[PDB]
Amino acid sequence: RSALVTGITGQDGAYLAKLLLEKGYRVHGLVARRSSDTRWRLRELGIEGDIQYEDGDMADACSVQRAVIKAQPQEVYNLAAQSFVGASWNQPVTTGVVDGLGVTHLLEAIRQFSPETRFYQASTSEMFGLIQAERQDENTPFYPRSPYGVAKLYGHWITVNYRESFGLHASSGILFNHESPLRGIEFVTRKVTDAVARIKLGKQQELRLGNVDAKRDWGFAGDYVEAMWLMLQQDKADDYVVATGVTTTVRDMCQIAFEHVGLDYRDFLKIDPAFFRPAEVDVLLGNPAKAQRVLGWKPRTSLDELIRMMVEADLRRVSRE
Numbered sequence: 001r002s003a004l005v006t007g008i009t010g011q012d013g014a015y016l017a018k019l020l021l022e023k024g025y026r027v028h029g030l031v032a033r034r035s036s037d038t039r040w041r042l043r044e045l046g047i048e049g050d051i052q053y054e055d056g057d058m059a060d061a062c063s064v065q066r067a068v069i070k071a072q073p074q075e076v077y078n079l080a081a082q083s084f085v086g087a088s089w090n091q092p093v094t095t096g097v098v099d100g101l102g103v104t105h106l107l108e109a110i111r112q113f114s115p116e117t118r119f120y121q122a123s124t125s126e127m128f129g130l131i132q133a134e135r136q137d138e139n140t141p142f143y144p145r146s147p148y149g150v151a152k153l154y155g156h157w158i159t160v161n162y163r164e165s166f167g168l169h170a171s172s173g174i175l176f177n178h179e180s181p182l183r184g185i186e187f188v189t190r191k192v193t194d195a196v197a198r199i200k201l202g203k204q205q206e207l208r209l210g211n212v213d214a215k216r217d218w219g220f221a222g223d224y225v226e227a228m229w230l231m232l233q234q235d236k237a238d239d240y241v242v243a244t245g246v247t248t249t250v251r252d253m254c255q256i257a258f259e260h261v262g263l264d265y266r267d268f269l270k271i272d273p274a275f276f277r278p279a280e281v282d283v284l285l286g287n288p289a290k291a292q293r294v295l296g297w298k299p300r301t302s303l304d305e306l307i308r309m310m311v312e313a314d315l316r317r318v319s320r321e
């Protein structure tokens with residue numbers, strides 16, 4: 001029972017790897033070459049030594065092919081990506097190559113070497129961007145609002161196309177924002193909790209955010225990776241929206257974070273235009289009805305609980321510096 005997880009050093013890769021290991025999977029994690037060790041998330045989950053690392057890059061089709069061949073995975077989870085919207089306008093090509101073509105690279109590796117391996121594409125609610133429905137489900141028309149959303153949209157559709165064109169068991173998980181103590185510092189939730197922690201510990205004096213009016217459906221990565229796995233356990237591949245069904249403004253989330261340490265965010269929050277987006281996704285609100293009905297998946301961790309554990313995690317990290 002082998003699984004190839006790209007983006008294994010990322011937030012989801014860590015939680016998914018952990019989940020896969022508990023299920024007896026030999027977990028192969030595709031790791032891009034970095035100048036320094038980037039496996040802290042895997043160590044945080046205590047599974048860094050339980051993964052068979054595959055040296056490769058999503059932009060290098062050959063290395064992706066090689067990793068698939070070496071892993072002989074029954075399941076492939078494509079979590080590798082330039083996953084930050086905030087960087088997609090600066091590097092729209094790498095975003096498209098990695099998040100879009102990278103999917104094709106994996107699908108091709110699968111199609112040409114082991115068409116039976118099940119594939120999971122890490123699609124995103126960002127694809128709904130300018131939401132065409134108050135609550136977005138699998139049938140809500142997509143409307144990407146960033147090179148990231150567009151690249152992912154490509155990733156989503158190419159996955160669907162390979163499923164439909166070759167009968168590949170390829171599924172696109174349209175996951176809405178999910179955070180955790182492993183959430184990248186680039187994302188608003190981790191940025192906030194990290195700031196709250198440093199502010200609380202007197203190592204920081206302010207928190208600079210952009211659009212605090214943006215509404216996000218935030219879930220726990222730990223819960224979401226379960227949906228990914230469940231998706232690949234289905235006999236027939238399909239796409240599913242995975243979300244909490246609850247959307248919150250960055251402001252309130254920010255308030256939740258500071259309040260958790262007895263602070264008033266208003267005392268440190270500073271709106272900085274440098275963090276505004278060229279084309280904003282004002283609100284995301286997912287409808288995971290299909291996932292609950294078919295996968296039996298449902299979110300367990302609420303935003304409050306999520307922010308709490310993140311703040312706690314960052315308080316521990318900051319206090320250890």
Ligand SMILES: NC(=O)C1=CN([C@@H]2O[C@H](COP(=O)(O)OP(=O)(O)OC[C@@H]3O[C@@H](n4cnc5c(N)ncnc54)[C@H](OP(=O)(O)O)[C@@H]3O)[C@@H](O)[C@H]2O)C=CC1
Nearest residue numbers: 007009010011012032057058079080081083122124177178
């Ligand atoms: N988290 C969310 O809220 C949402 C995320 N997603 C998507 O699901 C996936 C997992 O998200 P999450 O864990 O937060 O993402 P992260 O950004 O935390 O981690 C995934 C990344 O993939 C690796 N990666 C990036 N570029 C390449 C490359 N060219 N070749 C190989 N590996 C690469 C990164 O390594 P390195 O760090 O060294 O670059 C890192 O592991 C991503 O595809 C993301 O876009 C979908 C919906 C929502």
Ligand SMILES: Nc1nc2c(ncn2[C@@H]2O[C@H](COP(=O)(O)OP(=O)(O)O)[C@@H](O)[C@H]2O)c(=O)[nH]1
Nearest residue numbers: 085186187188189209210211212214250275277
């Ligand atoms: N990353 C980030 N987002 C911010 C910031 N200030 C406000 N936001 C907004 O909060 C939302 C969530 O951003 P992010 O966590 O990056 O996830 P996204 O949903 O993938 O864009 C968006 O609408 C951002 O524009 C900030 O400093 N950083």
